[PDB]
């Protein structure tokens, strides 16, 4: 198990969460919404492969992104 592979999955999970909240506000165009739907399926596949739960990975990703942007 690779630390960077796990961190990369966590960040992608959190950024998908940001994309989903943007989309919930009705701001996405059709290609944006197509990427959102396809990426959710890819993230579920990646999580199953890594043995990582998406809800947990999203919360870890939130902390990673907040730490990244504090600088």
Tell me the layout of helices and strands.
Elements: H1 3-24, H2 30-50, H3 54-70
Helix pairs in contact: 1-2, 1-3
PDB class: viral protein
Keywords: N-terminal RNA binding Domain, Influenza A virus, H1N1, Host nucleus, Host-virus interaction, Interferon antiviral system evasion, RNA-binding, Center for Structural Genomics of Infectious Diseases, csgid
Assembly: monomeric
3D architecture notes:
The chain is mainly alpha-helical. The protein has a single domain (1-71), classed as S15/NS1, RNA-binding (Helix Hairpins), CATH 1.10.287.10. Helices cover 85% and strands 0% of the residues. It is built from three helices and no strands. It has helices at residues 3-24, 30-50, 54-70. Helix 1 (3-24) packs antiparallel against helix 2 and helix 1 (3-24) crosses helix 3 (54-70). The longest helix is centred in the N-terminal third of the chain and has 22 residues, at 3-24. It is found in: Host nucleus; Host cytoplasm. Belongs to the influenza A viruses NS1 family. This is Non-structural protein 1. Homodimer. Interacts with host TRIM25 (via coiled coil); this interaction specifically inhibits TRIM25 multimerization and TRIM25-mediated RIGI CARD ubiquitination. Interacts with human EIF2AK2/PKR, CPSF4, IVNS1ABP and PABPN1.
